[PDB]
Amino acid sequence: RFEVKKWNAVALWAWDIV
Amino acid sequence: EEIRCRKYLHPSSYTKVIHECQQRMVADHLQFLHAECHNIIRQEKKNDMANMYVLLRAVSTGLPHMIQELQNHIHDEGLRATSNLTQENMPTLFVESVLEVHGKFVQLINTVLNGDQHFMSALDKALTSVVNYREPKSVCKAPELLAKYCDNLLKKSAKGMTENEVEDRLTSFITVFKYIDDKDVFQKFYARMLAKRLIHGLSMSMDSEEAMINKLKQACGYEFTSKLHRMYTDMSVSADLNNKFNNFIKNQDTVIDLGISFQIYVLQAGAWPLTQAPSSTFAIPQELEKSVQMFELFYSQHFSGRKLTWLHYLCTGEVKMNYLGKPYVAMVTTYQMAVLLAFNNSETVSYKELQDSTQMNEKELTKTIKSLLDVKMINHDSEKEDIDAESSFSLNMNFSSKRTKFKITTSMQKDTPQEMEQTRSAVDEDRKMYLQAAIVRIMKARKVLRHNALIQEVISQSRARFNPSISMIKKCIEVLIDKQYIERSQASADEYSYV
Amino acid sequence: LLREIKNDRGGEDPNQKVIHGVINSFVHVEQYKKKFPLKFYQEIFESPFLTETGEYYKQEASNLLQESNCSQYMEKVLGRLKDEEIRCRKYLHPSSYTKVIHECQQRMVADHLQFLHAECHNIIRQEKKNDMANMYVLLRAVSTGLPHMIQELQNHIHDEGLRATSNLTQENMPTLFVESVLEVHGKFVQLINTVLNGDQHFMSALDKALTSVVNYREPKSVCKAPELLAKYCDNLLKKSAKGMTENEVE
Known part of the structure; x- marks a missing residue:
């Protein structure tokens, strides 16, 4: 069994195409 | 003679008598003083240097040779004091040696030369040529060293350093960096290092990062550090955004x-x-789909017009194991x-199972397999431990480590030389773009130019970010012969014309 | 004689002296005639040449068009124009240099102006810094041409500028607006000076594309732009808590 915790995810934002 | 002229003559002739005495006592013997000037500088006799500086301030044209001798001696001293260094403390030792030479030749230029500004410009030019000591047929090694020095200073290290000590050492770094003439390469190296430190949490204090960005801002204006400031602010407001997301949910x-x-x-x-x-393409795991969807919902309903890109290249997460x-x-x-x-x-599991579950490519999968195999968190059941077409391996029940928070993440810093030359190539590409733009704006302004005049104008105009050597301008000119508006003239081979 | 030219256009090379010797032998025969000394040359090796090279480049263009995409097509075509310029001076009389290249262009980039202008939008949107340069040259010497790219890039900078104004944060809208326009103007005055070049047709194609951005108001509203520049100009002059010096303000 595997379970995850503390997701220090990183994402980038940019202006949308429209 | 000053005493004599002030005790007999009229006060209006103090200047003419003193200047005339120096016009015969020192100006007529200018050759002898200039001959001994180099020897006096090389031995660095402070009293004789001060007397020579005074006597050559007296002469109208005696000063520049003194300036040239001081500049040449300082350049020689710096180039001998920075070239030979160890390869494990080179980033610290290079800046330390340049700063030591600068401190010595600010003291010795301000206490026995009255801090004459021409001599300070000579010091500045000499150390400018010292710091960017390009090895022949090789790229410059200054900006990489300066960026590595700043990354060494600012990151949370186990050596232990006082915050105010970091502040004053970074001020000294700015005094070194103010003449590097390769600020574009340093800017992008420091941008990548700042990105890695900010993301991985290795900065010792955000206040120190703000101080460093500010110091670079007074060093090279605001457009130099606009991207760095946006990085620091968008890392600082992350806490506010996360609290806003929690208030949303x-x-x-x-x-x-x-x-x-x-x-x-x-x-x-x-x-x-x-x-x-x-x-x-990468596939988000099952239980994280709710988190990704909810964050997208928050970022789209409370905020507008911007599309996320979950890059996953540097994401982290703490998996808890509950089988042992x-x-x-x-x-x-x-x-x-x-x-x-x-x-x-x-x-x-199997290899094809891993691609139908995660959709990742073979290179990243091989990297993760090697990372888990070196840790031996997951043992490999096939004969050979490399990449396998089947890749049939099971869970490792022999994992008996000791640390309660052991990780399979060791890419905290890395910075392989492949990455360094990739960033150097990207900066060189942007340099090609900017240099082509400068060449053609100057040409369109003139519509007829000699080759050397164009070289001088381009070097003058593009001085705002670096000093491109003539090799880059020749490469950009040869590129612009094919692409777009420039052509060799028919009258001569150095009469570039706008088409 | 035309078969030797076609052999040269096929890749090999005939005798450089002999081919130029006989083509220059159509001038230097009518050299003594006062009116129209090139009259013999204009009717024996100009019409039979321009028609033949027009026919040869009418079908060679269709071979390249159907064998490669638009990106590789502009590499081969601009390669041929550079190559045909050499093959025009190697053989022909100097008074027919322009006509052969113009005949080469009019059947390689003007016969396919419909194809090129359909790919003009896709190149600028992806911001390819190489094919957008090659498209400019093929659309420079042809009048029916460039004003489509003028309108296309004006329809792209304004499209990039719009995304730098809409959905912009109210927290620091003064500084963030002026920086975003300067970021858009800064990038697209260097790219229009390198991939393209300083061209008042194209430089005005930025201003017309940007005056529709620094004046873009949503329908039935007061234009927010003049106060956004006014509030921003006040913050730099007003005593701010950031404590920026005079050097970063001027």
Whole structure:
């Protein structure tokens, strides 16, 4: 069994195409 | 003679008598003083240097040779004091040696030369040529060393340093950096290092980072550090955004129940030097779909017009393992947790199972397999430990480590020389773009130019960011012969014309 | 004689002296005639040449068009124009240099202006810094041409400028607006000076594309732009808590 915790995810934002 | 003229003559002739005495006592003997000037500088006799400086201030034209001798001696001293250094403390020792030479020749230029500004310009030019000591047929080694020095200083290290000590040492770094004439390469190196430190949490204090960005701002204006300031602000407001997201999920009508502690570190992709290098598609694991969807919902309903790009190149998450009696928790890269949730289905797996579960490419999968295999968190059941077409391996029940938070993440710093030359190539590409733009704007202004005049004008105009050597301008001119508007004239070979 | 030219256009090379010797032998025969000394040359090796090279480049263009995409097509075509310029001076009389290249262009980039202008939008949107340069040259010497790219890039900078104004944060809208326009103007005055070049047709194609951005108001509203520049100009002059010096303000 595997379970995850503390997701220090990183994402980038940019202006949308429209 | 000053006493004599002030005790007999009229006060209006103090200047003429003294100047005339120096016009015969020192100006007529200018050759002898200039001959001994180099020897006096090389032995560095402070009293004789001061007397020579006074007597050559007296002469109208005696000063510049003194300036040239001081500049040449300082350049020689710096180039001998910085070239030979150890390869393990080179980033610290290079800046330390340049700063030591600068301090010595500010003291010795301000106490026995009255701080004459021409001599200070000579010092500035000499150390400018010292710091960018390009090895022949090789690229400059200054900006990489300066950027590595700043990354060494600012990151949270186990050596232990006072915060105010960091402040004054970074001020000294600015005094070194103010003449580097390769600020574009340093800017992008420091941008990548700042990105890595900010993302991985290795900065010792955000206040120190703000101080460093500010110091570079007074060093080279605001457009030099605009991207760095946007990086620091978009890392600082991350806490506010995460608290806003928590307030959003609190205010939702239904129970959200993410199940995962979530901090997102959203970054302005128009200014962060991160790249979408893993353009291969990655699949978000099952329980994280709720988190990703809910964050997208928050970012779209409370905020407008911007599209996320979950890059996953540098994401982290703490997987808890509860099959060996809940032994330890491992903080891993998101690909590693993807293969761990693949293991959650069954102990043994297969290669094609990994691609139909995670959709990742073979290179990143090989990297994660090697990372988990070196840790031996997951043992490999086939004969050979390399990449396998089948890749049939099961869970490792022999994992008996000791640390309760052992990780399979060691890429905290890395910075392989491949990455360094990649960043150097990117800066060179941008230099080609900017240099072509400067060449053609000057040409369109003139529409007829000699070659050397164009070289001088381009070097003058593009001085704002660096000093491009004539090799780059020749390369850009030869590129512009093919692409777009420039052509060799028919009258001569050095009469470039706008078409 | 035309078979030797076609052999040269096929890749090999005939005798450089002999081919130029006989083509220059159509001038230097009518050299003594006062009115129209090139009259013999204009009717024996100008019409039979321009028609033949027009026919040869009418079907060679269709071979390249159907064998490669638009990106590789502009590499081969601009390669041929560079190559045909050499093959025009190697053999022909100097008074027919322009006509052969113009005949080469009019059957390689003007016969396929419909194809090129359909790919003009896709190149600028992806911001390819190489094919957009090659498209400019093929659309420079042809009048029916460039004013489509003028309108296309004006329809792209304004499209990039719009995304730098809409959905912009109210927290620091003064500084963030002026920086975003300067970021858009800064990038697209260097790209229009390198991939393209300083061209008042194209430089005005930025201003017309940007005056529709620094004046873009949503329908039935007061234009927010003049106060956004006014509030921003006040913050720099007003005593701010950031404590920026005079050097970063001027």
